[PDB]
Write a protein that holds these residues in place. Structure first.
Motif, mmCIF file in Angstrom:
data_model
loop_
_atom_site.group_PDB
_atom_site.id
_atom_site.type_symbol
_atom_site.label_atom_id
_atom_site.label_comp_id
_atom_site.label_asym_id
_atom_site.label_seq_id
_atom_site.Cartn_x
_atom_site.Cartn_y
_atom_site.Cartn_z
ATOM 1 N N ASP A 100 0.851 -1.186 0.000
ATOM 2 C CA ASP A 100 0.000 0.000 0.000
ATOM 3 C C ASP A 100 0.888 1.238 0.000
ATOM 4 O O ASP A 100 1.565 1.524 0.992
ATOM 5 C CB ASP A 100 -0.936 -0.003 1.204
ATOM 6 N N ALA A 101 0.877 1.972 -1.114
ATOM 7 C CA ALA A 101 1.675 3.187 -1.239
ATOM 8 C C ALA A 101 1.088 4.358 -0.463
ATOM 9 O O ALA A 101 1.789 5.352 -0.246
ATOM 10 C CB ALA A 101 1.814 3.572 -2.712
ATOM 11 N N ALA A 102 -0.177 4.268 -0.048
ATOM 12 C CA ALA A 102 -0.823 5.385 0.631
ATOM 13 C C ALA A 102 -0.187 5.643 1.992
ATOM 14 O O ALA A 102 0.314 6.741 2.262
ATOM 15 C CB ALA A 102 -2.319 5.106 0.779
ATOM 16 N N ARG A 103 -0.196 4.636 2.864
ATOM 17 C CA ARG A 103 0.261 4.799 4.236
ATOM 18 C C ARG A 103 1.702 4.357 4.450
ATOM 19 O O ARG A 103 2.231 4.548 5.550
ATOM 20 C CB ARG A 103 -0.664 4.031 5.186
ATOM 21 N N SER A 104 2.343 3.772 3.442
ATOM 22 C CA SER A 104 3.784 3.567 3.497
ATOM 23 C C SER A 104 4.490 4.904 3.311
ATOM 24 O O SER A 104 4.101 5.712 2.464
ATOM 25 C CB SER A 104 4.222 2.576 2.421
ATOM 26 N N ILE A 105 5.528 5.139 4.109
ATOM 27 C CA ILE A 105 6.127 6.462 4.247
ATOM 28 C C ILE A 105 7.550 6.444 3.709
ATOM 29 O O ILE A 105 8.302 5.485 3.924
ATOM 30 C CB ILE A 105 6.103 6.931 5.716
ATOM 31 N N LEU A 106 7.917 7.521 3.016
ATOM 32 C CA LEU A 106 9.263 7.738 2.503
ATOM 33 C C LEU A 106 9.764 9.078 3.018
ATOM 34 O O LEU A 106 9.083 10.096 2.861
ATOM 35 C CB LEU A 106 9.284 7.721 0.973
ATOM 36 N N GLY A 120 26.593 11.648 3.326
ATOM 37 C CA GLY A 120 25.341 12.226 2.874
ATOM 38 C C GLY A 120 24.224 12.034 3.879
ATOM 39 O O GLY A 120 24.406 12.193 5.092
ATOM 40 N N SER A 121 23.043 11.689 3.367
ATOM 41 C CA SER A 121 21.844 11.525 4.174
ATOM 42 C C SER A 121 21.221 10.170 3.876
ATOM 43 O O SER A 121 21.412 9.598 2.800
ATOM 44 C CB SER A 121 20.833 12.644 3.898
ATOM 45 N N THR A 122 20.459 9.663 4.840
ATOM 46 C CA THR A 122 19.873 8.332 4.752
ATOM 47 C C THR A 122 18.424 8.421 4.289
ATOM 48 O O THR A 122 17.624 9.162 4.871
ATOM 49 C CB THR A 122 19.941 7.618 6.103
ATOM 50 N N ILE A 123 18.096 7.662 3.252
ATOM 51 C CA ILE A 123 16.719 7.518 2.795
ATOM 52 C C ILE A 123 16.073 6.400 3.594
ATOM 53 O O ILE A 123 16.690 5.356 3.837
ATOM 54 C CB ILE A 123 16.663 7.222 1.283
ATOM 55 N N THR A 124 14.825 6.612 4.006
ATOM 56 C CA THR A 124 14.102 5.649 4.828
ATOM 57 C C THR A 124 12.738 5.397 4.208
ATOM 58 O O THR A 124 11.950 6.332 4.033
ATOM 59 C CB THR A 124 13.951 6.156 6.264
ATOM 60 N N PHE A 125 12.463 4.141 3.877
ATOM 61 C CA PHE A 125 11.161 3.728 3.381
ATOM 62 C C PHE A 125 10.505 2.795 4.388
ATOM 63 O O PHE A 125 11.184 2.077 5.126
ATOM 64 C CB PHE A 125 11.274 3.030 2.028
ATOM 65 N N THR A 126 9.170 2.815 4.412
ATOM 66 C CA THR A 126 8.383 2.042 5.377
ATOM 67 C C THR A 126 7.240 1.375 4.613
ATOM 68 O O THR A 126 6.156 1.949 4.475
ATOM 69 C CB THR A 126 7.866 2.933 6.498
ATOM 70 N N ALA A 127 7.488 0.163 4.126
ATOM 71 C CA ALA A 127 6.470 -0.571 3.390
ATOM 72 C C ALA A 127 5.321 -0.957 4.311
ATOM 73 O O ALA A 127 5.529 -1.346 5.463
ATOM 74 C CB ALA A 127 7.073 -1.822 2.751
ATOM 75 N N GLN A 128 4.099 -0.845 3.797
ATOM 76 C CA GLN A 128 2.912 -1.160 4.580
ATOM 77 C C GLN A 128 1.853 -1.767 3.673
ATOM 78 O O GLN A 128 1.579 -1.238 2.593
ATOM 79 C CB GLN A 128 2.358 0.090 5.271
ATOM 80 N N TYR A 162 13.075 -0.213 4.482
ATOM 81 C CA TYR A 162 14.228 -0.369 3.610
ATOM 82 C C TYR A 162 14.916 0.986 3.514
ATOM 83 O O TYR A 162 14.267 1.983 3.183
ATOM 84 C CB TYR A 162 13.800 -0.866 2.221
ATOM 85 N N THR A 163 16.216 1.030 3.809
ATOM 86 C CA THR A 163 16.956 2.282 3.879
ATOM 87 C C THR A 163 18.170 2.240 2.959
ATOM 88 O O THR A 163 18.611 1.173 2.523
ATOM 89 C CB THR A 163 17.416 2.576 5.313
ATOM 90 N N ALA A 190 6.601 13.259 -2.213
ATOM 91 C CA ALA A 190 7.821 13.766 -2.823
ATOM 92 C C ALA A 190 8.846 14.095 -1.748
ATOM 93 O O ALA A 190 8.526 14.726 -0.738
ATOM 94 C CB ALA A 190 7.512 15.008 -3.661
ATOM 95 N N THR A 191 10.083 13.657 -1.968
ATOM 96 C CA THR A 191 11.160 13.858 -1.009
ATOM 97 C C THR A 191 12.387 14.371 -1.747
ATOM 98 O O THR A 191 12.795 13.789 -2.758
ATOM 99 C CB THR A 191 11.484 12.560 -0.266
ATOM 100 N N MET A 192 12.968 15.455 -1.240
ATOM 101 C CA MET A 192 14.080 16.133 -1.886
ATOM 102 C C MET A 192 15.323 16.067 -1.013
ATOM 103 O O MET A 192 15.239 15.954 0.214
ATOM 104 C CB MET A 192 13.737 17.600 -2.177
ATOM 105 N N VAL A 193 16.481 16.136 -1.665
ATOM 106 C CA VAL A 193 17.772 16.196 -0.991
ATOM 107 C C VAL A 193 18.641 17.149 -1.799
ATOM 108 O O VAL A 193 19.088 16.804 -2.898
ATOM 109 C CB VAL A 193 18.444 14.821 -0.870
#
Length: 335
Positions: A100-106, A120-128, A162-163, A190-193
């Protein structure tokens, strides 16, 4: 009843955690001689799902229908016969199924970092799952849209997350993307760096400042027209990779001397502690003493030559104030 001659198991051992996916919990029951046992009152207790009513079977077997709830994990099956707990184990895995892309967070911890920082910086994904349960084992993959930026190692944290880090040598804003098993997610936050400029290259070839004689002159400064003494222009600064740095220049005006179109030769005391930004348009240093009322008079007295030493003494890197010593001359220069 014997613990070793009896089995508690449920199949399909993996069932999607929807309200429909059922499972059959089988309790094979035998005595110490392995001879089957019949006519026993059994009760099943699971940690997930809805158990139907228990029913006897042939060869000393008992069954109940577990309709899958809507939670992922492993339903630990406990069993009791005649109100006495039996020491046999068993369980069934409730699978989440789809993502579910709705409540999974990036999200990224740092929306910006410099091109010198390799971490750099760490990308963090949260599959749901649709129901809000984690999803593991996905063939996740992150991506970026900015050139010369690299995605680093990726990890299946076995908890729906997943990071992976990111770093770039080329300045700019690097949106973040994700895909699973070669399939890109559609509607996601949308996430920017932004890549901050790195460390200025001490061994830079190009110049940084240009002092010039006045052309533009005789214009209302304090409501009156004054002669412009000199003009200052700055240029771009670059890190070791070549990305435009926007820093501060610290220079000192020298005790200059000039000559006007009427042949007069005057002097102008220098000044210390002057500042200006890099890549900046002309800064008209005007004779603070002028007071000409006629643009014609001032122009008939414009400065024809200036002899002064302009000296840049320090540059301000994005991480420290580096000291330098760059000189710039008009004519013979200050004395």
């Amino acid at each position: 009843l014997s613990t070793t001659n009896s089995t508690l198991v449920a199949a399909p051992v993996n069932i999607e955690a929807n309200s429909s996916d059922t499972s059959v919990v089988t309790l094979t029951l035998r005595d110490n001689n392995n001879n089957p046992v019949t006519g026993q009152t059994v009760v099943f207790t699971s940690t997930l799902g809805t158990l139907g009513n228990v029913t006897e079977q042939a060869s000393g077997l008992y069954t109940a229908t577990l309709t899958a709830g809507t939670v992922s994990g492993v339903a630990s099956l406990s069993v009791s016969v005649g109100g006495n707990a039996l020491g046999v184990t068993g369980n069934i895995t409730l699978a989440p199924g789809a993502l579910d892309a709705a409540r999974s967070i990036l999200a990224v911890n740092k929306p910006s970092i410099n091109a010198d920082d390799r971490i750099g910086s760490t990308i963090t994904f949260t599959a749901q799952d649709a129901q809000g349960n984690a999803i593991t084992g996905l063939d996740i993959a992150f991506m970026t849209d900015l050139e010369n930026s690299q995605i680093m190692t990726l990890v299946d944290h076995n908890d729906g997350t997943y990071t992976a880090n990111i770093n770039g040598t080329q300045t700019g804003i690097a949106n973040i993307a994700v895909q699973s098993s070669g399939a890109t997610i559609a509607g996601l936050a949308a996430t920017m760096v932004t890549i901050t400029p790195g460390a200025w290259n001490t061994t830079q070839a190009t110049p940084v400042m240009t002092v010039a004689l006045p052309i533009t002159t005789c214009q209302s400064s304090s409501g009156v027209y004054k002669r412009y003494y000199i003009g200052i222009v700055t240029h771009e600064l670059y890190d070791n990779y070549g990305n435009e740095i926007s820093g501060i220049l610290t220079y000192n005006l020298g005790a200059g001397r000039y000559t006007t179109v009427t042949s007069q030769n005057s002097s102008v005391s220098g000044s210390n502690g002057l500042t200006r930004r890099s890549n900046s348009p002309v800064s008209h240093f005007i004779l603070t003493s002028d007071a000409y009322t006629s643009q014609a008079a001032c122009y008939a007295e414009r400065i024809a030559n200036v002899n002064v030493t302009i000296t840049v003494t320090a540059i301000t890197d994005d991480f420290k104030t580096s000291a330098v010593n760059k000189v710039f001359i008009l004519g013979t220069g200050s004395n």
